[PDB]
């Protein structure tokens, strides 16, 4: 019911360099996590941060603004799929430090092109159609990058919706490995 | 509130060969347009048929339906404006039969372009926008058509919301004169 | 609950050459005074058409389609005022037929200028706003000349709500005389 | 629920010159009662008309177009007040022909002065809470008239709602006499 | 307001062996399509019937009622595109009787595959969707068949939505001819 | 919009004997058809009557009252899938006279176990439990009478939701034959 | 109303390794869940954690994510069923360390097949269903693995829902013993 | 409005072993009390704890893991009622340790039998409706055993909701006594 | 916009041994009072208690914990009246320590019979209706033992409301005097 | 579920000169940003001051507070855009210190003219329809300053939607350059 | 999601003297700007106050409670309008110490005649349009005053919206000077 309050759970975990991305991505949580990740590099640059994810996706351009962030501050950040990451939440995982980039044994991964609506006059209607179809091929081309697929293998697997299981994920470079270690 | 029920108003008036298109635009309203062209039509293929119009515009393909059948059928079919002809209001407008094309002194007219809108994923938004387009291509040939007009004059002219007065409709060939007629 | 079956008290009276012009002025019911009025033309060129008005306004290019039609009939249009008649209603009243439009005892005639409004980009927001002054021009116009008033006081006087006794309108020029006939 | 039919209930009590006023006077319903009467009149100008009245009241311009056609017509309308005549009801009941006022044994007549409402700039609500006063005005000339009471006593006497029996009411002046007639 | 009635329009036509599919297809609508063809057949086993259709589709299995009463009836039924005809609503337009399907000069027609859904266990989601699987072969195969295409054709062309022009309906073989017949 | 007066379009068909079951089966919709079942009967007992089922079930209690209605009539009651015949709708499909029960080419028929539910009192709860287990067997039992198949049979296939085409359905004996003959 | 303001006695208890599982599985409660079981790791990787579960189930990705966690952590994690353990809170509970599952003496437990809809293309419909039946074989799998019990035994009892008491439950294999100890 | 801010005088009543169950019983607030309960076991053993009771009942399944963590802790739980407990709050006043449960006054109770609901196929109405009848025959064997009152005694006064005064309570064993000891 | 925080107002007069009852009598608006209650006592087992009392009443059983209670503690417990205290509120007021229960000046104090309503079978409706019968005789019983009134007469005196001025509720017993010692 | 409780992580990295400005721009979150500017000024009024720009537009006075009080502060305010800029967004963007507006490498920009509407009298249309004309103008020169393109380059860029990626900004100079800093 | 938390910015910037008067104004925001001047008066009743200004008008009561308190207070209060400061907003910030009351260059301010709205009785109405009338009056005395502009000038200027830029506003009186000090 509260973010326990031992010094609250979620700030006793930051102190250890991990941060979570939970459910819907939008501007407002999004923000969050790019706080916390710049906190967390100037608490010390050199250290790598672990990036939790369980997310069926969201708003592409909050989407973004933790994608730079990753991309751009010093540490590497680990990403670590729990649960799903979907659509926007898939492509946030498959941008983490190569090498560090894991699933658990459980977790699916999915992944699609984007999704939009615009209502007006047709020339306004065909700017913003012309809008969204760059930002596909932006995001086929990045998710190409960080996989190692090809740009049509992707753009083929992306048309109508892709599940995987965390092997197949494996298999298909969106991930390194699977984080197994029981006892 | 409903038929004058003398008979009817609207259908005393229909046996003097006169129609009314009152209102959005859309497929009932529409259907019950073309039933009673057809019908006058069966009742006599040689006499003139009056279509009165007061419209804020509707539904693209609803009119169509109409412009059609207007063209398709031997009466021609004379077009007299009271009120307002806007969008769609004023492409039937125009799309009467030449020289029978009319405006009252204080009608207002008004033309622009194709309005519309969709949700969905990016591969699918380019298929509608893609259509409208044709839309709005085809709409432009047939007011130019109809007015005399460039077809680039159309294009320019149709952007953005545009009115005409009754003594403009005619300089710019919407319609054929203004009924005055006092008394 | 229902209109009153001696055949239709409307179309009974309508034999008569009465219309009515009731509430609300908007398109449908604009349409149906409209038919009417055609249909006691054709009925009788030469015969005098009774409009009864008891209305507060409404859809101004609803009301101009009525206007009109009653400019453009052979029959003179006498025009009286039960209740009272406001906004459009007013200007209608006013249109009737020179030396033929009356207010009873205690009508109440109210005059003013028009209301619109927009909600888009200022581009657009401006080529409406410039209709709207078009229309209050033709409207300040046809308004000084039916009732002999100045443009300027007609103006003047429309800026704000302003309501007339039935002597006040007779004076204003508004109305022609005063109906009383007691029993 | 819906009409009895021996040729629709009303209809039929129409040829016999009766006229019924039930329930909230509004526009609609007031131009239906001009209807009627004008029907009457054009069908024997000098026969009596009946006119039952159980109403709360309702909008004055309606109501008013009610009053200046029964002074107007030729035949003298006679009032009957069934259940209550109240506010603009109690005020056309006693506007009946003098002489043909009725009130029915336990009919329930109750008077009161206008009331309205206005929001908007303050010279706005001034124009309004100026007109309503004249109105209030108007209505208190009408009933010292009808009841023969002074202007100021009626004046006084509508400031706040007052309740009147139908004896109180033949009394005050309201009505004429009470409508017995049993066996 | 009502079916223009000269013993309403849509009567007289039927006589003339017209019927109208307009708006959303669903079961009821339907059942007065089926009803009337059955009447048309029973009055004369020969002539014509036309089914004049402007309409964006609906549910599949009331258009499927619709469909086999076409085929089975003795009359050739001709279909007419008039306004649009996409989906179920274009299968029905070129299920008429071979060369006797027409499509108006600015008709749109559009194709595509059937939409669905559900919610429960997983047993039962297995059942429901490989019951819509069969239904889309099935759907195919037949529009394979009436159109001339190959199934594979139809299944690539379907996948997505698909618009066509009146004179691409006509060489794609949903639609024979154009009726353009001026005038 | 209406239904098509050639004389009532469904009047004209009941009189050539034909009845149609359309949408969710209900009390008042079945008590229609128990009607029309009653009034032919009444007309003549030895013609056959035909009832053209499309729906996908309903209420159990109102279409049993159809059910009892087939049986006891004199007349035989032929059968007519179009669209589809879904939960009682098959059961009122195969009902029908053996050897008039008919499937169109393209008919969905669908068979499955009831849906209930109540809410309350646990000793209630067991009491409304125990009745729709009553009615799961009467109806299994019944079902296997009209198709020739083994109660065990017809339970084991209705656990779960079952569909059938055309030839199935036959295959099945849940209907006769599959009715064709084009022209 | 709030918490224990002693300074929040669920943080207490957490300071002696206890974790509440308690209403409807989701995303942020899970991720919760999944944080206090890494902080208690940190505190001590030997030491056991005692996860009591009182749930009626719900989204299975959310559960899942804490099913990967429960595993991967080097501490034993003990499950207790208080109240009710149904479908994924059933699935979580039996998911604890062998040998320290426990239900207490009333507890209710229960297991189903997992549940699921979407809406869409028969493309679409297809790939969701796919998926959802990939979900349930890896869901049975898992339950078969943990209770000792046949994988077609499962499946065979997950088919509907089904209920067990304590003993049921443990003599199934899902929780090792029953709690009881009184005083 | 808020907590009394003097630390909670809840939580200081806490430190006095001093637990209040108030207004429904559902599962947050129920692992409240667990919580409490647990932590006051820890905090001592041997001490007694205290457990007021207000509430007209709620959810068995939430109640049911207050009442296994009564029985189960070593502390005696002693139980008050004040205002009332009603089906499961009375289940859980007779449930206190014996000796140690009390009435005020003017408490009220009253006892029923469970109270469930579904919608469903008949199939899963079966295991639904079986399982609540089980949960109701255990609920009447522990009642039985904490009153001292016969099985089949419980099982006939529960059919219909029974209430008792403080009096009746002690008398009928659910309680020991009542708490009194003014001043 | 909160409490006033000095220490938090309320916990601060907690301290000077004030407890405040306001508004409507709910469970837990109650519950709060009772933990007040109990902790002063515990404080101070000798000192007077002061509630101040503005109510309009509530539910029975709420203020019937807070009755019980007041009897309950060893310290005496005063009430005091501000603004009204109606039905239970004026209960609660009564039942203060003799001697020690007042009234301010302007206080209202109404008094009255119970209120109620179920839903349900004829056997369940009678079971509750006896029960509200009972619950007025006793709560009848304790007004006349702290007013000194006879039974008979509360029971006259309430089975209408009974409004009581601060000097009429001294003289009714209500309240023994009224505080005003002003300066 | 809270901003990061360790001191809050914005208000950490609010004195290391960070705000953050997030979601629609308006008067309160406007206001939040406002008091964060003149708070690290009067810390230091010569140390840069780090703006980051998420935001989809908002409301232009809100807008203008932030722009206003960076412009007037001695330190300097960088921006940088992560996630998108749009409209107001956009151009809060360009706005800061020459040299130091930045883009992350993902970022999208959207540039477009003011929106709007009113609705009341014409003269008050006219009115609102100058002053936001007068805004689109003083906005269209501030975008030329910032971005060093001519009046009329900008005003022909702004009439309809204009996005730009980031180089595509970095040549517009809305930008000074892109970040992109890995590791 | 939460005030900027470095000791709250506002409290931060309140040692400053710093008060914001942010959005529509109304009792409770106007409730506490008069607290914060009462307590700066306190600190120091020579030192100066800073109050910033970014509003669309509001409640007039609330906003004279304002007014009447800053001349009221030893301080001087400067006047710092950013964003808007609209009808409300306005007249406060003119209202500032003379020659302390400032623009942010882009500021846009706005001045009219009060607004409002009876409904009632006649009588009442009057009561309420003459106070409203009475307001004006004050409310364009003061604005004379504080601006130096004469009565008559400020009528004539306020009868309808009037906007000024940030320089308009200082050569109409309403401010003293612009301030954009940079860097």
């Given at each position: ?6 010094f609250?759970?979620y700030?006793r975990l930051?102190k250890?360099?991990?941060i979570?991305?939970?459910g819907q ?9 790019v706080?916390?990740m710049?906190?967390?590099?100037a608490?010390n ?7 939790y ?6 708003v592409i351009?909050?989407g973004?603004?933790?994608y730079?962030?990753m ?7 680990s990403?670590?799929?729990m649960g799903?990451?979907?659509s ?11 090498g560090?980039r894991?699933?658990l ?7 699609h092109?984007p ?10 209607i065909?700017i913003?159609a012309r ?7 932006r ?13 049509e293998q992707?753009e083929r ?5 892709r599940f995987l299981?965390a092997?197949?994920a ?13 006892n």
């Amino acid at each position: 019911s509260r973010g326990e309050r031992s010094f609250d759970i979620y700030s006793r975990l930051l102190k250890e360099r991990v941060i979570f991305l939970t459910g819907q991505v939008e501007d407002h949580m999004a923000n969050l996590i790019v706080a916390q990740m710049l906190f967390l590099e100037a608490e010390n640059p050199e250290k790598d941060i672990y990036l939790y994810i369980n997310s069926p996706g969201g708003v592409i351009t909050a989407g973004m603004s933790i994608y730079d962030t990753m991309q751009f501050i010093k540490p590497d950040v680990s990403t670590i799929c729990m649960g799903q990451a979907a659509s926007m939440g898939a492509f946030l995982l498959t941008a983490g430090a190569k090498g560090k980039r894991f699933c658990l044994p459980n977790s699916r991964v999915m992944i699609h092109q984007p999704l939009g609506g615009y209502q007006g006059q047709a020339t306004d209607i065909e700017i913003h159609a012309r809008e969204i179809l760059k930002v596909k091929g932006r995001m086929n081309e990045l998710m190409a990058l960080h996989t190692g697929q090809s740009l049509e293998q992707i753009e083929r697997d992306t048309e109508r919706d892709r599940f995987l299981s965390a092997p197949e994920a494996v298999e298909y470079g969106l991930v390194d490995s699977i984080l197994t270690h029981r006892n």
